[PDB]
Design a binder for this molecule. Structure first.
Ligand SMILES: [K+]
Ligand SMILES: [K+]
Ligand SMILES: [K+]
Ligand SMILES: [K+]
Ligand SMILES: [K+]
Ligand SMILES: [K+]
Ligand SMILES: [K+]
Ligand SMILES: [K+]
Ligand SMILES: [K+]
Ligand SMILES: [K+]
Ligand SMILES: [K+]
Ligand SMILES: [K+]
Ligand SMILES: [K+]
Ligand SMILES: [K+]
Ligand SMILES: [Mg+2]
Ligand SMILES: [Mg+2]
Length: 1328
RNA sequence: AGAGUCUCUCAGCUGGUACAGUUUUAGAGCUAGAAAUAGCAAGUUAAAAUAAGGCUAGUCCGUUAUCAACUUGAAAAAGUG
DNA sequence: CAATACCATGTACCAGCTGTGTGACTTT
DNA sequence: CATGGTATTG
């Protein structure tokens, strides 16, 4: 008995089917377990497992990270309170107690209700003197008087609790960042370099202009407007633009041929500046550094909007400025409305529900919403002009705690913290001794390379301690081994050398590693001149001369440099042909040139004895990112370089790791030669073997040593470690579990073949890619055309912005209002490359202007547009892949071989994850070896792409309509098995391409015509009825009988669709903290916080339901009453219930619980009632639809054709259209089937009647549109959670199943993973 | 079937921080009326919690992955049509 | 109990490692 | 998002 398996692997489904010799699906009688009168059932061997998408670990991680955050912020406060403990006890022995219980209601408070002082008089006086915390912070920073210890704590706690970000390194000078003085010094540094062309900056108010609440470009234009004879694109203008955070281009200033675009935010700027400074000299370093300082001052002026010469608390001062202008503007705003229109006053200042001032302070109105609600109310009135200016600057009626306070660095809070400590350490001796300890609390943060401060109970931790004691902010440098921990942070993630599995991989930028990559490429170069008979390799001398002369003097080596600076200069060749490298060498001694600039000792770099030291310095620069730690590690060589060079060495940091170890490159040696790998790359006679040849050569001992160097996951573990979406990995494991069961079903007989086919908030990302691209481009298109992230979901508008509002084939502007008239065109034609991503797509006025349509854009378009494309590439508005394709016509365009490859890739799957599934299945099936110790491939694992079966369906009218039911998953798998087996049966030579295990015109023709053998006529040409294998003579396909077989299988109504039951996990409930309410739905946020007094959560998530048969007390009498009901065990209750189910249930009220009748009921548990009606458990108190509507095939194909689902010849198109119109009565028949089914299992009288009326209303509608909208109707009958749907313009809301009472007496069905094995439990026989 | 390199792209996993939001309390509302309410005044801030919580008590852990039923079995697992 | 309606924590930055598909050079 | 929780209204 022989058979094959077909699989369809998706992210929510695994379709499966068993086929025989004749492409038939078998049917078996299967045992049925349980207490029903049915002992067995007939099942077709075809079905599909359905499951909810697997989730990533990200959300779990972000929540984990926040938890740690909250724990450590509490610890900071506890540290500070510990310091204050004894001395605060002398002043107020319950202060910290009133703070701790501030949340409680006075009924539960054990102390007085006024937290700071403990009486109403002092408390009210406090708030009158210090309405915001920032008033108190400024007073404590400025005043010279002794202050109450409790107010000192509150100001220091507020700074430590909300301490600001750590994005800036070093200390901040609040007086050294004066915008006027940094602008004056930029002017002075410019006038030094350009004495003949100086700028008159007198009368220019640099402070107001650059610190103004305006866009960077507008402030730039404002300042230049004050300077006559200076343009914003001149050198000075560009420097101001750099200061404002824009991205200017200094190429045109210094007459450069290449482009020096500079932005101060990019990580590349440090190199970007040095690179520019290399061309124009170091005299300009003072100019470009002076501009950097100005930027710092302007950034601070966004935060500090107050003169820093009247207070040492400019931040708190600026918060107080917000409060004062809020108060003044509120007084005036009220007066205006009071007089100009008093009818709206009640709506504005008293209605929390409205987005007025009441809703903005007391309700849920945000600043953005408040501004919207009040913008017309201001425009409508008189005297509102200044307020309207503040509203448009987003600076009206501001609160102090706002979304934009993320700008504040921690150095500013620290400055006020250190000032207060300096003021009060004069009166309190414990503040002078703990001044630094308190300062450390605010400033300390765990280094990212240290991680959780665990003690052997964190699977996430790696930190190692220098001593076993409690870590605090003050002892961290001593208890935590920062060096070892920083090393583990990387070495626990990096790859080992695959060849030498115990050797660590070299840093990517290691000098030795780059010597290797350059010699390995250089060794395969070949050249030929006139006198030479044939091309030749480079000798060891030639390669060394080339490395010394070119690679050690030029960052990148082009072929031109090789020809002129080597072959002409040295070999005296006026002409030479080069091979093995094109345009320029891909490898380069980059680190060599970085170190030559820093240390300026070329002879040190070339001395081989320094190889070790240089290797350790680069390793240290790569391994660590902390500049102190880097400095500490490089101390060993402080004697070798100047302090200036050592400082420059500290600042140079590298990232990335190679793929080979040092031991492999330049350690192990060949036994007879005594030479390392690098030695052979430098010199290997006239064979010039490269890395691949060396480690594979049997005449050397490298290969032997590799195998000796080499040194068991579970199925689940192995799948977890695959590179791919966790979603697809869930289906991969489910697939293997499906195959195991199917083999057990066939009496442990292995199949002949297994054919597998695998399926194929971004608006935040799409917006960020256009902002960066446009600001890098320097364009004002976002100014002229504001856009929201949601709109960028539209393809044409997204392409418009990525192309900066220009046609991509013609150098012209595009109209944003005309996009409907424009064309979206594929760079590589979709006839060749089925790619619809933005990466192969282009917005043009008309696709005609691309050129010819059988190739990549014409040469003329490339000549026209290459430069504009280059800008888009650098602005990252197109990728390198998109630019390369866009420009291929200048590289010959698409070749015939390229076209052959494209067609082949349409048919042969090459994705790595697909190969891994095949390898998993192949290694599970084929386990025995033959006389030659080679694997015996009893089972052939075939992998197909989705296009094969999809074209099969459209070619033989086996159409699919996904919306009808879930059967198409199972049918896809059947067709995969059929097509896959028949394909390799017809052409056994294909096995190399389609089975796992180990002229261009011809292949193009061949692969385009590979599937013709199924057809009876082609294009013209005709074929036999019976198709056979040429060699064996065996029949593979009968075009009369075998299509009928397929048609029978797709028509079968019984298909085993199983929805994987799953225990729900994750969050306990909705996260929203709700206000207090008298409802038992509310759940306490802490053990003692009664939700009736404090609010809390609701909407818990049921992990699984439980069938309880027990008795419950009834009435005031408490008489025991027998019941049977469903209890949802929430995720939070789950551990408590499982530890002791009986105690848990008795706590809930149940008595005499029949412990053995407790049934665990996860989500999607399956119940059958009367007339075949099936329900799935959505929750403990809601149900989902549990039936599939097996619509007959004739209707399915009619719906597909009538609806124009997806082309064919005209004689075919008209034949299909004629069939649609000849079978128009099918429309009513389809409705009848739906209604017959809805009345049998759906049971939504209201919705069914509403739909019938809607269908009888739109009978005069076109047939195509009636069919398209019949497709929507299957939502009413679709398996799963009910949902809303629209028939034409009528909307049908979901009818839900809000009670689970009926399943308590129905038949519960437990299914195996295929659903072929069943246990059925009559629940009516329980509770008697 | 792979391997190294160059320019990239997309994805996965981990760590260190920040700002808001929400919730309860505190921030004496006034006047006139028995009240009902009306007319006003006010508003910007803070503490605390931010999965209940756990023992292993760490400045640690708590939302990913995995899961029909039955039989033996503390459990892990294997077995069952 | 129907039918019906409303609701659902969000944002920002920094430091890493891995594999992926891409199209080029070289190779087993 | 989409689907389960919750309340309101009849
Ligand atoms: K993170
Ligand atoms: K009390
Ligand atoms: K000017
Ligand atoms: K608000
Ligand atoms: K409040
Ligand atoms: K106005
Ligand atoms: K707030
Ligand atoms: K190249
Ligand atoms: K580094
Ligand atoms: K020195
Ligand atoms: K789960
Ligand atoms: K579980
Ligand atoms: K199941
Ligand atoms: K990469
Ligand atoms: Mg906690
Ligand atoms: Mg807050």
């Amino acid at each position: 008995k022989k058979y094959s398996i077909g699989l369809a692997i998706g992210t929510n489904s695994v379709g499966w089917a068993v086929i025989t010799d004749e492409y038939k699906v078998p049917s078996k009688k299967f045992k049925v377990l349980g207490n029903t009168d049915r002992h067995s059932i007939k099942k077709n061997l075809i079905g599909a497992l359905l499951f909810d998408s697997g989730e990533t670990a990200e959300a779990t991680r972000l929540k984990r990270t926040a938890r740690r955050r909250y724990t450590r912020r509490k610890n900071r406060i506890c540290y500070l309170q510990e310091i204050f403990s004894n001395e605060m006890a002398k002043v107020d022995d319950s202060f910290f107690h009133r703070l701790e219980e501030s949340f409680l209601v006075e009924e539960d408070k054990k102390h007085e209700r006024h937290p700071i002082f403990g009486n109403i008089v002092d408390e009210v006086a406090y708030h009158e003197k210090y309405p915001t915390i920032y008033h108190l912070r400024k007073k404590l920073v400025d005043s010279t008087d002794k202050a109450d210890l409790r107010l000192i704590y509150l100001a220091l706690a507020h700074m430590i609790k909300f301490r600001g970000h750590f994005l800036i390194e070093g200390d901040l000078n609040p007086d050294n960042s004066d915008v006027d003085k940094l602008f004056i010094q930029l002017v002075q540094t410019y006038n030094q370099l350009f004495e003949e062309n100086p700028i008159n900056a007198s009368g220019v108010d640099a402070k107001a202009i650059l610190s103004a609440r305006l866009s960077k470009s507008r402030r730039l234009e404002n300042l230049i407007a004050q300077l006559p004879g200076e343009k914003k694109n001149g050198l000075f203008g560009n420097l101001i633009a750099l200061s404002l955070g824009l991205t200017p281009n200094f190429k045109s200033n210094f007459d450069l041929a290449e482009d020096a675009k500079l932005q101060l935010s990019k990580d590349t700027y440090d190199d970007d500046l040095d690179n520019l400074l290399a061309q124009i000299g170091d005299q300009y370093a003072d100019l470009f550094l002076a501009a950097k300082n100005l930027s710092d001052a302007i950034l601070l002026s966004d935060i500090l909007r107050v003169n820093t010469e009247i207070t040492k608390a400019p931040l708190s001062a600026s918060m107080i400025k917000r409060y004062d202008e809020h108060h003044q503007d509120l007084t005036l705003l009220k007066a205006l409305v009071r007089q100009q229109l008093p009818e709206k006053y009640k709506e504005i200042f008293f209605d929390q529900s409205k987005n007025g001032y009441a809703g903005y302070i007391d309700g849920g109105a945000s600043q953005e919403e408040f501004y919207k609600f009040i913008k017309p109310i201001l425009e409508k009135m008189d005297g509102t002009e200044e307020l309207l200016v503040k509203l448009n600057r987003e600076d009206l009626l501001r609160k102090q705690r706002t979304f934009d306070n993320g700008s504040i660095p921690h150095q500013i809070h620290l400055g006020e913290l250190h000032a207060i400590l300096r003021r009060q350490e004069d009166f309190y001796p414990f503040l002078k001794d703990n001044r630094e300890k308190i300062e450390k609390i605010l400033t300390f943060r765990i280094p990212y390379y240290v991680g959780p401060l665990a003690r052997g109970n964190s699977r996430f931790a790696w930190m190692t301690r220098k001593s076993e004691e409690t870590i605090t902010p003050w002892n961290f440098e001593e208890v935590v081994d920062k060096g070892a921990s920083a090393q583990s942070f990387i070495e626990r993630m990096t790859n080992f050398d695959k060849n030498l599995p115990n050797e660590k991989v070299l840093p990517k930028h290691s000098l030795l590693y780059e010597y290797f990559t350059v010699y390995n490429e250089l060794t395969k170069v070949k050249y030929v001149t006139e006198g030479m008979r044939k091309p030749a390799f480079l000798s060891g001398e030639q390669k060394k001369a080339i490395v010394d002369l070119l690679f050690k003097t030029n960052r990148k080596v082009t072929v031109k440099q090789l020809k002129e600076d080597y072959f002409k200069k040295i070999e005296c060749f006026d002409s030479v042909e080069i091979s093995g490298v094109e345009d320029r060498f891909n490898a380069s001694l980059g680190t060599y040139h970085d170190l030559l600039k820093i240390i300026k000792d070329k002879d040190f770099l070339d001395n081989e004895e320094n190889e070790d030291i240089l290797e350790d310095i680069v390793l240290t620069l790569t391994l660590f990112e902390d500049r102190e730690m880097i400095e500490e590690r490089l101390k060993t060589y402080a004697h070798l370089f100047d302090d200036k060079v050592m400082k420059q060495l500290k600042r140079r940091r590298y990232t990335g790791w190679g793929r080979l170890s040092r031991k492999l490159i330049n350690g192990i040696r060949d036994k007879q030669s005594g030479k390392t790998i690098l030695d052979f790359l430098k010199s290997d006679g006239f064979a010039n073997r490269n890395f691949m040849q060396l480690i594979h050569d049997d005449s050397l001992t490298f290969k032997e040593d590799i195998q000796k160097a080499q040194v068991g996951d579970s199925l689940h573990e192995h799948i977890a470690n695959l590179a791919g979406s966790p979603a697809i990995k869930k289906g991969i494991l489910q697939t293997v579990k499906v195959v195991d069961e199917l083999v057990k079903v066939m009496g442990r007989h292995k199949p002949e073949n297994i054919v597998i086919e695998m399926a194929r908030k971004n608006s935040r990302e799409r917006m960020k890619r256009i902002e960066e691209g446009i600001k890098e481009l320097g364009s004002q298109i976002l100014k002229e055309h504001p856009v929201e992230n949601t709109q960028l979901q539209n393809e044409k508008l997204y392409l418009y912005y990525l192309q900066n509002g220009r046609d991509m084939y013609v150098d012209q502007e595009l109209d944003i209002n005309r996009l409907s008239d424009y064309d979206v065109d594929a760079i590589v034609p979709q006839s060749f490359l089925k790619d619809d991503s933005i990466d192969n797509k282009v917005l043009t006025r008309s696709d005609k202007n691309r050129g010819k349509s059988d190739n990549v854009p014409s040469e003329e378009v490339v000549k026209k547009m290459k430069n504009y494309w280059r800008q888009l590439l650098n602005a990252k508005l197109i990728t390198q892949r998109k630019f390369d394709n866009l420009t291929k016509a200048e590289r010959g365009g698409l070749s015939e071989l390229d076209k052959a490859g494209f067609i082949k890739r349409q048919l042969v799957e090459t994705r790595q994850i697909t190969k891994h599934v095949a390898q998993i299945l192949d290694s599970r099936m084929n386990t025995k070896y033959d006389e030659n110790d080679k694997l015996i491939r009893e089972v052939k694992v075939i992998t197909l792409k989705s296009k094969l079966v999809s074209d099969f369906r459209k070619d033989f009218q086996f159409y699919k309509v996904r919306e009808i039911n879930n059967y198409h998953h199972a049918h896809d798998a059947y067709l995969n098995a059929v097509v896959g087996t028949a394909l390799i049966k017809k052409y056994p030579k294909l096995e190399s391409e389609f089975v796992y295990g180990d002229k261009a015109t011809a292949k193009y023709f061949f692969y385009s015509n590979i599937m013709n053998f199924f057809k009876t006529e082609i294009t013209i040409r005709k074929r036999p009825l019976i198709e056979t294998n040429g060699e064996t003579g065996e029949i593979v396909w009968d075009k009369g009988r075998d299509f009928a077989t397929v048609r029978k299988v797709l028509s079968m109504p019984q298909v085993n669709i199983v929805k994987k039951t799953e225990v729900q996990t994750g969050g306990f409930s909705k996260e929203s903290i709700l206000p207090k309410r008298n409802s038992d739905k509310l759940i306490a946020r802490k053990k003692d916080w009664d939700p009736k007094k404090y609010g809390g959560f609701d909407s818990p998530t049921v992990a699984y339901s439980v069938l309880v048969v027990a008795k419950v007390e009834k009435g005031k009498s408490k008489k025991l009453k027998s019941v049977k009901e469903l209890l949802g065990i929430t995720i939070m209750e789950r551990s408590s219930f499982e530890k002791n189910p009986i105690d848990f249930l008795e706590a809930k009220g149940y008595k005499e619980v029949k412990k053995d009748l407790i049934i665990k009921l996860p989500k999607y548990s399956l119940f059958e009632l009367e007339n075949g009606r099936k329900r799935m458990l959505a929750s403990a108190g809601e149900l989902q639809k549990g039936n599939e509507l097996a619509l007959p095939s004739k209707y399915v194909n009619f719906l597909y054709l009538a609806s124009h689902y997806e082309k064919g010849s005209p004689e075919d198109n008209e034949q299909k259209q004629l069939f649609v119109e000849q079978h128009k009565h099918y429309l009513d028949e389809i409705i009848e089937q739906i209604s017959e089914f809805s009345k049998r299992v759906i049971l939504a009288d209201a919705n069914l009647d509403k739909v019938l009326s809607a269908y009888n209303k739109h009978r005069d509608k076109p047939i195509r549109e009636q069919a398209e909208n019949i497709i929507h109707l299957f939502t009413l009958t679709n398996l799963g959670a009910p949902a809303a749907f629209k028939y034409f313009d009528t909307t049908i809301d979901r009818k839900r199943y809000t009670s689970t009472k009926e399943v308590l007496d129905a038949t519960l069905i437990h299914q195996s993973i295929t659903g072929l094995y069943e246990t059925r439990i009559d629940l009516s026989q329980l509770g008697g």
